[PDB]
Amino acid sequence: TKAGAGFKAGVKDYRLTYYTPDYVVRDTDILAAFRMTPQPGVPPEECGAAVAAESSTGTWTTVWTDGLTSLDRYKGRCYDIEPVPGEDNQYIAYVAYPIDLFEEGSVTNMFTSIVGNVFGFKALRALRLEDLRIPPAYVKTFVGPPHGIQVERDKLNKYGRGLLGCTIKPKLGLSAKNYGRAVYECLRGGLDFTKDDENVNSQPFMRWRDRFLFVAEAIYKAQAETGEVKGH
Amino acid sequence: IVGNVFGFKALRALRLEDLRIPPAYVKTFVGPPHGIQVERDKLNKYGRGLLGCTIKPKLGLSAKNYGRAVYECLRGGLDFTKDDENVNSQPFMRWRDRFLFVAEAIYKAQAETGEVKGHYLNATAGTCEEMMKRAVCAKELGVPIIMHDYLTGGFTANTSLAIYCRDNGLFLHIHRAMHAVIDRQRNHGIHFRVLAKALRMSGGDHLHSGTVVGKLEGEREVTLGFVDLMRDDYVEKDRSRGIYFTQDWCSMPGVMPVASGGIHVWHMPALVEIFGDDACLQFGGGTLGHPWGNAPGAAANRVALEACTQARNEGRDLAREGGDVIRSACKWSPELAAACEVWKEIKFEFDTIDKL
Amino acid sequence: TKAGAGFKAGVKDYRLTYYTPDYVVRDTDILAAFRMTPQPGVPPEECGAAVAAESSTGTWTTVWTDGLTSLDRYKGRCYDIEPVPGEDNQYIAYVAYPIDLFEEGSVTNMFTSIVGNVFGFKALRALRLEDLRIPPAYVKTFVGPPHGIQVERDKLNKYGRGLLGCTIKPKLGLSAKNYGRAVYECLRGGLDFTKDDENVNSQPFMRWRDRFLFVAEAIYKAQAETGEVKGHYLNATAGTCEEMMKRAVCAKELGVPIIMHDYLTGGFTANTSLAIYCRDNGLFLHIHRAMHAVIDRQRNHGIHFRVLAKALRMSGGDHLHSGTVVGKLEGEREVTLGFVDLMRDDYVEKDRSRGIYFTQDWCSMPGVMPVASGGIHVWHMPALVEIFGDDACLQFGGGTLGHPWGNAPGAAANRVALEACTQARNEGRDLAREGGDVIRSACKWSPELAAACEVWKEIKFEFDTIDKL
Amino acid sequence: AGFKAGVKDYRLTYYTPDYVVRDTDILAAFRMTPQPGVPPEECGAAVAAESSTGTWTTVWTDGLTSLDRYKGRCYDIEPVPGEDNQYIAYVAYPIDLFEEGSVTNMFTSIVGNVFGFKALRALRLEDLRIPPAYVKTFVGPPHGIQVERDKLNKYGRGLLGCTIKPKLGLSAKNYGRAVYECLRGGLDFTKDDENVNSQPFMRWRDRFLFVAEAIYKAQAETGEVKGHYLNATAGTCEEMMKRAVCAKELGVPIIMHDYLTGGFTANTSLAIYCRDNGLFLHIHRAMHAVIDRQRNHGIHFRVLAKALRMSGGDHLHSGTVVGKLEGEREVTLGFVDLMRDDYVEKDRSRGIYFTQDWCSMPGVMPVASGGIHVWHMPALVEIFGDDACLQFGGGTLGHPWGNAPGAAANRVALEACTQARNEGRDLAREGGDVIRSACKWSPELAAACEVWKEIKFEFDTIDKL
Amino acid sequence: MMVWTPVNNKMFETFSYLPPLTDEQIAAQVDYIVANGWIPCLEFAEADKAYVSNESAIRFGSVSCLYYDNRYWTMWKLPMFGCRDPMQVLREIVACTKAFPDAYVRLVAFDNQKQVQIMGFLVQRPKSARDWQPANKRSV
Ligand SMILES: O=C(O)[C@@](O)(COP(=O)(O)O)[C@H](O)[C@H](O)COP(=O)(O)O
Numbered sequence A: 001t002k003a004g005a006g007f008k009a010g011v012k013d014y015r016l017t018y019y020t021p022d023y024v025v026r027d028t029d030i031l032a033a034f035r036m037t038p039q040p041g042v043p044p045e046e047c048g049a050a051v052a053a054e055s056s057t058g059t060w061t062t063v064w065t066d067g068l069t070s071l072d073r074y075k076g077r078c079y080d081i082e083p084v085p086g087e088d089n090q091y092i093a094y095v096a097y098p099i100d101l102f103e104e105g106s107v108t109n110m111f112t113s114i115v116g117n118v119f120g121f122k123a124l125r126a127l128r129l130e131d132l133r134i135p136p137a138y139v140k141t142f143v144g145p146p147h148g149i150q151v152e153r154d155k156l157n158k159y160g161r162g163l164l165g166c167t168i169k170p171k172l173g174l175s176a177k178n179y180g181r182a183v184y185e186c187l188r189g190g191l192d193f194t195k196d197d198e199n200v201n202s203q204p205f206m207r208w209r210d211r212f213l214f215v216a217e218a219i220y221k222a223q224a225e226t227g228e229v230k231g232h
Numbered sequence B: 001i002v003g004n005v006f007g008f009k010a011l012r013a014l015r016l017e018d019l020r021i022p023p024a025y026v027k028t029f030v031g032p033p034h035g036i037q038v039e040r041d042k043l044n045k046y047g048r049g050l051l052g053c054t055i056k057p058k059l060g061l062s063a064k065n066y067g068r069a070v071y072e073c074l075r076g077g078l079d080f081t082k083d084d085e086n087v088n089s090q091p092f093m094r095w096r097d098r099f100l101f102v103a104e105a106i107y108k109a110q111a112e113t114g115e116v117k118g119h120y121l122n123a124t125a126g127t128c129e130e131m132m133k134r135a136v137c138a139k140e141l142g143v144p145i146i147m148h149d150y151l152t153g154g155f156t157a158n159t160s161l162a163i164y165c166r167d168n169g170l171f172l173h174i175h176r177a178m179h180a181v182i183d184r185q186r187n188h189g190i191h192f193r194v195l196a197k198a199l200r201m202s203g204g205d206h207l208h209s210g211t212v213v214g215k216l217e218g219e220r221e222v223t224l225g226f227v228d229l230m231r232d233d234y235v236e237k238d239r240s241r242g243i244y245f246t247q248d249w250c251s252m253p254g255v256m257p258v259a260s261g262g263i264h265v266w267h268m269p270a271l272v273e274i275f276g277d278d279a280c281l282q283f284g285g286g287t288l289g290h291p292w293g294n295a296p297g298a299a300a301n302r303v304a305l306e307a308c309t310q311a312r313n314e315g316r317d318l319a320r321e322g323g324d325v326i327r328s329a330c331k332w333s334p335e336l337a338a339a340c341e342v343w344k345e346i347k348f349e350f351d352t353i354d355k356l
Numbered sequence C: 001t002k003a004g005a006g007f008k009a010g011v012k013d014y015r016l017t018y019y020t021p022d023y024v025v026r027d028t029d030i031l032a033a034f035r036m037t038p039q040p041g042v043p044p045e046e047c048g049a050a051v052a053a054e055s056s057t058g059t060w061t062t063v064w065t066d067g068l069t070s071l072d073r074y075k076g077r078c079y080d081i082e083p084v085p086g087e088d089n090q091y092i093a094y095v096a097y098p099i100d101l102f103e104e105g106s107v108t109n110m111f112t113s114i115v116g117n118v119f120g121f122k123a124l125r126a127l128r129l130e131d132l133r134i135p136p137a138y139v140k141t142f143v144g145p146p147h148g149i150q151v152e153r154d155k156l157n158k159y160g161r162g163l164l165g166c167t168i169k170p171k172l173g174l175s176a177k178n179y180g181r182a183v184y185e186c187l188r189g190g191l192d193f194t195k196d197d198e199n200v201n202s203q204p205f206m207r208w209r210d211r212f213l214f215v216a217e218a219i220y221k222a223q224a225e226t227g228e229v230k231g232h233y234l235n236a237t238a239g240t241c242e243e244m245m246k247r248a249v250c251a252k253e254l255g256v257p258i259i260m261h262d263y264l265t266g267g268f269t270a271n272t273s274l275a276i277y278c279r280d281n282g283l284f285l286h287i288h289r290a291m292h293a294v295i296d297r298q299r300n301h302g303i304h305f306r307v308l309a310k311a312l313r314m315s316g317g318d319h320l321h322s323g324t325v326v327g328k329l330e331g332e333r334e335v336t337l338g339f340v341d342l343m344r345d346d347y348v349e350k351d352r353s354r355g356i357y358f359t360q361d362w363c364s365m366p367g368v369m370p371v372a373s374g375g376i377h378v379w380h381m382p383a384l385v386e387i388f389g390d391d392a393c394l395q396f397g398g399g400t401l402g403h404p405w406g407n408a409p410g411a412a413a414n415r416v417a418l419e420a421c422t423q424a425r426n427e428g429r430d431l432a433r434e435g436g437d438v439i440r441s442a443c444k445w446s447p448e449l450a451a452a453c454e455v456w457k458e459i460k461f462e463f464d465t466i467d468k469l
Numbered sequence D: 001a002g003f004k005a006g007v008k009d010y011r012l013t014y015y016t017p018d019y020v021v022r023d024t025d026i027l028a029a030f031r032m033t034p035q036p037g038v039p040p041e042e043c044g045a046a047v048a049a050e051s052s053t054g055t056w057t058t059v060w061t062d063g064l065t066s067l068d069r070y071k072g073r074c075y076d077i078e079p080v081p082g083e084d085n086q087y088i089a090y091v092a093y094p095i096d097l098f099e100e101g102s103v104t105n106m107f108t109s110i111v112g113n114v115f116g117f118k119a120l121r122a123l124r125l126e127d128l129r130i131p132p133a134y135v136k137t138f139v140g141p142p143h144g145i146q147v148e149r150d151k152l153n154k155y156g157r158g159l160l161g162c163t164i165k166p167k168l169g170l171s172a173k174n175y176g177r178a179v180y181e182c183l184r185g186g187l188d189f190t191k192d193d194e195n196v197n198s199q200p201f202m203r204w205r206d207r208f209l210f211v212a213e214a215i216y217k218a219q220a221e222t223g224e225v226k227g228h229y230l231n232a233t234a235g236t237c238e239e240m241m242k243r244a245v246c247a248k249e250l251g252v253p254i255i256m257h258d259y260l261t262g263g264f265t266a267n268t269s270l271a272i273y274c275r276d277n278g279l280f281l282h283i284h285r286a287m288h289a290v291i292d293r294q295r296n297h298g299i300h301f302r303v304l305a306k307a308l309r310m311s312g313g314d315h316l317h318s319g320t321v322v323g324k325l326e327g328e329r330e331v332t333l334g335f336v337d338l339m340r341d342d343y344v345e346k347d348r349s350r351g352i353y354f355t356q357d358w359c360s361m362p363g364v365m366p367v368a369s370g371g372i373h374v375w376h377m378p379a380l381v382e383i384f385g386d387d388a389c390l391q392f393g394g395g396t397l398g399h400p401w402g403n404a405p406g407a408a409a410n411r412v413a414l415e416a417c418t419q420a421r422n423e424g425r426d427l428a429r430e431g432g433d434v435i436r437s438a439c440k441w442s443p444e445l446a447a448a449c450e451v452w453k454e455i456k457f458e459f460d461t462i463d464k465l
Numbered sequence E: 001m002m003v004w005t006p007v008n009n010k011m012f013e014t015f016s017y018l019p020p021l022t023d024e025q026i027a028a029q030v031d032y033i034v035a036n037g038w039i040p041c042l043e044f045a046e047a048d049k050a051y052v053s054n055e056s057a058i059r060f061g062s063v064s065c066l067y068y069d070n071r072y073w074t075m076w077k078l079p080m081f082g083c084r085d086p087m088q089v090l091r092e093i094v095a096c097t098k099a100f101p102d103a104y105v106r107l108v109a110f111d112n113q114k115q116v117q118i119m120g121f122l123v124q125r126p127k128s129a130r131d132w133q134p135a136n137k138r139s140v
């Protein structure tokens, strides 16, 4: 009748819960590699543990509600720290996240946990996410790409070489009609694709639906002229 | 403005520090669903900062336990609680179960206290359709407020959500998850003040602003600068606060700053002094970490806020007398005393990276 | 310049491609255990290979198109064959299917491959699917159950005992008004739920929407009277998806807690749709396994119920009927304990003494509440509580509506019996040994229970078990 | 007659050997194996009771209604010749028990719970008499045999089809490539394999598009109408409908559905969509043999076939008799008549337990498929006649010269048999001669004849009468 | 034939159809919590908040399915994490009932592996409650 693990209010080191150097990663875990620069006087283990904690289940002080659930089951785990060769104050900290933490099909949610708050922590000077291990069990929750490389080449009927494209210029300032004129002249000469510049959306000098129409005319003219499938 | 130029070989580093958005461009945006004035008017809350709280642990709680924690928090004196930024829909707790239990908790706490309550239900999702489905469920439950992670969700989804909120009378709390990936380093990225201007244009009723004194970085003068940018109609150029351009918002509504992250009762005087009344102050750990539970934790934070507010109104200087105000309040309130005792020695003081 | 593997037209043995006894299974493979009875003159290896082939990529003769893709990557593989002890001509053939073969989130597609054509092959005399290993990577593609056990208890605010239900009787022929009348009288006496019989849909004697309305009145009356949350599983089972949805929508609009679906007679495609609707609208979904015994009764041929139960958990259901062991319908004890664990638990280790052929990891997919129903009465209570524990619903149709004093006394007798057993167990009494004493003490105390005890004292269902391990 | 609590025998209420069946009753023939010590009368009565109105103890609520009006009735029990403990129990169900238009509801009553009863060792549903008054409540098949031939403009011979192989693993583009090469050589149809839905190696909408190109190329090339059964089978009703919609928008003639693995509720929905949008619906019977293989327990396929005709389908797989999958001749001829004909008289030598009046509900085209090749052609034409589709998957894509020569070989074989029959030749006796003459004439056919000359599927039959 | 009364016959979930629990019977339930390693907790509510109701649904669209007010009660202190002493639970029952003599008070226990309440029963009802029957007056 001597008490087990009770609720104890107050701040303790993250490393007491979130640094687990003997943890064996599971094949369903999401893994992260953080390049981490601690503030002076912050041990790398505590820094990695902080990153693991505040991107998964933990906050700055002990909360009682932990006891209603199972922290062991849900916590992120800093399971390894490598020093960076050539660097006095840089470490690769490896963190394992259980698959349960993540919304199926949502890149948004994955980023929110893994890069949401930890980059702003006063206790580090710099943090870079270098890599993520996305397990098959998580990959399978995503629709993924509409088509992908094989299907694209199959629909375009284009094989045996790289594809050729071209962004229309100037970036901004061309009228819809002049956009389609440029497009037709590019495509007819041997390019497979042309494109809107990234910042060409819908603007006073050229509204999108006018562009789409003139471009469609240009695509079909170049395709009829060359006998090769074209796109923009 | 930031599409391609940051990757040019010919430069080693580039940082966007500020943008002057002209009235003629500002006027093309719907902007925030409501803004500070309307928010206070609908909530019927005036004369002090608002108090909020993130439920913890971040992940791993069931829907029923979520609502339980929410009810205990709200009933003790907090105006709002919230889903953690990464609480969306997960195997341990599916969103619609949470929404329902949270709605029960909101209405119980409101009936019990006689004060309007809310909980920021997270609409952040994988797709626009899912995000909307969640916003719709909140509307149908009659609850006051939802939240969105605008950078991880993205501007296109955020603007859609803000327009929905305007059309259906929902408050929209914005979390800035991911900002420090972009805005932490002095030499490269985009300064948060630009990310904050962008959010005001895209639409949000609240935006996280930093604490200055809590666990996350935010220098005082920098913070005061962009808080003015978020709230005010007209902000003159002032390089000592990082304002590079005079900014005219041409009556676009102001966005309520939210100070959150590693703060507790002893920070209260400093928080009220930095932000004034038009802010929301959030205590997650600082509520759910109270030795007596959520309701006493909420009461302690509410007492602290009210004591500081009263002291300031009576002419006391919170920058100088802040400790005395808290100490007098701990002597008077047992709930507050228990909080004062636990976090007395806890401070976050580190060399600032994002310096002017 | 001398050729590699070309296209060679003609028939060859399936074993040349599909029997791979040295294959190491991958953690993303779907595994099947087939109890297989070959025709005389057919080697078990060739039989297992045929099953593997014709449930994955292969047909009866060599096709040239194989060479355009990679058979090694896609083929099902018979990787192991066990002889069956006690049997001269029965084998357990183990087949591994790559995850690539399956449509994400579709139980329909999984069944189509694994059980689609192979059971009718002339070269075998009988085939039974005993188990499937559903890997986490596949499990994660399913929405799964709308709520599951924890959420159900939390929404109903019911803890610390089994739930009690009851099917309204007679099966067919009652009017909507009499349905609601019976429902009210059952619920008010202490039952948590009543239910439409599996075959109550919409009929000339009682149209569905009339029933739904009267039942809603009954649920709210009983709830206001007792102060406990009540429900009635309203049947959404219908001839088309559109009708089924219409019925679910009416239940949502009435604000009632729970609907039901016959997942095998309605089918997996309709059931998954319904389960998704229930998730999006906060309705509980009770699953009735009507037709299962057509498939799962015989030891030599069919699909064991444990596989039908896994499939339901993937497709979606908050409750699933599990058998009683002791009632009027067949279900051997060890077999039942096995699949109840498969329905409810997150992780179940291989255990052949319970018919579990594979370790099954559910990767946090919610558990399904087993429902024990059919030919049970107050004297079965101790055994039921001992077999299932608290995470079950126990249903008394005849055992309620057959009480000499009517539905409310019948409900009260069942509720008293359940609570007495629960209390005795909690106090440290052994329900397996002291069960009769617990019920006898309870009959002496409760007149309602005594009347039930007296009527059904001699009634037992004890017969030779067909579906033996 | 007051309420008396307690258990009594089912036979007191549910065994009615003097009952005269009504012309609106649904009738059922159960092959029943009782546990030792259970009289056949009590077993039949239990089956009648627990598939209609009764439970294991007496309920008071019976008195509020009229049990005589609603109860199922075991009205006859035949002993099974050759069997010491098997009986045919006949049950009559009043039409009032059943939801109009719902095969789902009919199955739920008649096969819902009774197969799991401890008091029996085995139970098989052999047949159902669906009365005209119940048949008329169903939409039925979208089109049926007559309309299908009329829209396709194809008359005077069996239709020819082909499943693309390998079953799984081909890309969308290679799918369409194989389809085009099959269709152009003389096949009327190709099809998605039953388990081809939407998968990592091939997403459905990519397949639908490539297949549409292939259909139209083969049609333009040959001058004959072509089709490919695009699979709408899916995890949910919404996905299934999405696929049906895409087929409609591409203007293609035909889709397919796995009615047992998809289920009756989804199938009836799909059939109604097909009726409203003019799509043919090919039904695959994936999973049937799980239910219908064993003599002692399950549901005979003829009942599954009647259910499909009510639920809706333009084609239904029927077995081959001679191919890789089981199907005894007399049994098969019986249910083919049940699928196609308006009126089928009782005939126990073909497994028909009841006279079945379909009251003008359209007939369903039988599809013979699975392990068949050119040498089977005479036997296939003799068993099925012209109103069938014959499918050669391996028998087309396994041809040594590729798909178009494989298709041509099958088409030549079919037309030669058809012509021979029309000229007065007996295909049962002269079949080999007809094929041999045709191999001598056609090099494509000769190549097929050579490769599969020795290949036969002859095994002891499990599902015997 | 006895008739189950619909009048003032409200119940309180688990064990409310049995004779009221003696102190020895409560102690035995408490031992069962400790023997299984579950987390004991007390909850309480004033009479007006004791039974399930619908008042918040006035604010709803068509979303009232499995929404009820008064499912949540008020927590007495915190769940007793790590408690392995039954006397400690009994002392909290005494302290809780003393502070709220007119409230309904229930004892519950949590399992943190399943994350669900695993047991629960009423340990006090207000003396002024008139909406319930003694066991021998439940039927007439
Ligand atoms: O997840 C967290 O750490 C918090 O919930 C605070 O928890 P505590 O109250 O328990 O500290 C907030 O999301 C951060 O404050 C966000 O940072 P910022 O506002 O700077 O964007």
Ligand SMILES: O=C(O)[C@@](O)(COP(=O)(O)O)[C@H](O)[C@H](O)COP(=O)(O)O
Residues within 6 Å of the ligand: C167, C169, C171, C197, C198, C289, C290, C321, C322, C323, C324, C329, C371, C372, C373, C374, C375, C376, C395, C396, C397, C398, C399, D050, D055, D056, D113, D116
């Ligand atoms: O129709 C019936 O017989 C029941 O309503 C029970 O009636 P009683 O309570 O009167 O016996 C149930 O549907 C069966 O238990 C289903 O069997 P299972 O659970 O084995 O699938």
Ligand SMILES: O=C(O)[C@@](O)(COP(=O)(O)O)[C@H](O)[C@H](O)COP(=O)(O)O
Residues within 6 Å of the ligand: C054, C059, C060, C117, C120, D163, D165, D167, D193, D194, D285, D286, D317, D318, D319, D320, D325, D367, D368, D369, D370, D371, D372, D391, D392, D393, D394, D395
């Ligand atoms: O998957 C197969 O094996 C088939 O594609 C035939 O392939 P082959 O033409 O290459 O033999 C058919 O689906 C079966 O005939 C179905 O059997 P049934 O018609 O009896 O239901």
Ligand SMILES: [Mg+2]
Residues within 6 Å of the ligand: A167, A196, A197, A198, A199
């Ligand atoms: Mg560009």
Ligand SMILES: [Mg+2]
Residues within 6 Å of the ligand: B054, B083, B084, B085, B086
């Ligand atoms: Mg947070």
Ligand SMILES: [Mg+2]
Residues within 6 Å of the ligand: C167, C196, C197, C198, C199
């Ligand atoms: Mg039933």
Ligand SMILES: [Mg+2]
Residues within 6 Å of the ligand: D163, D192, D193, D194, D195
């Ligand atoms: Mg096939």
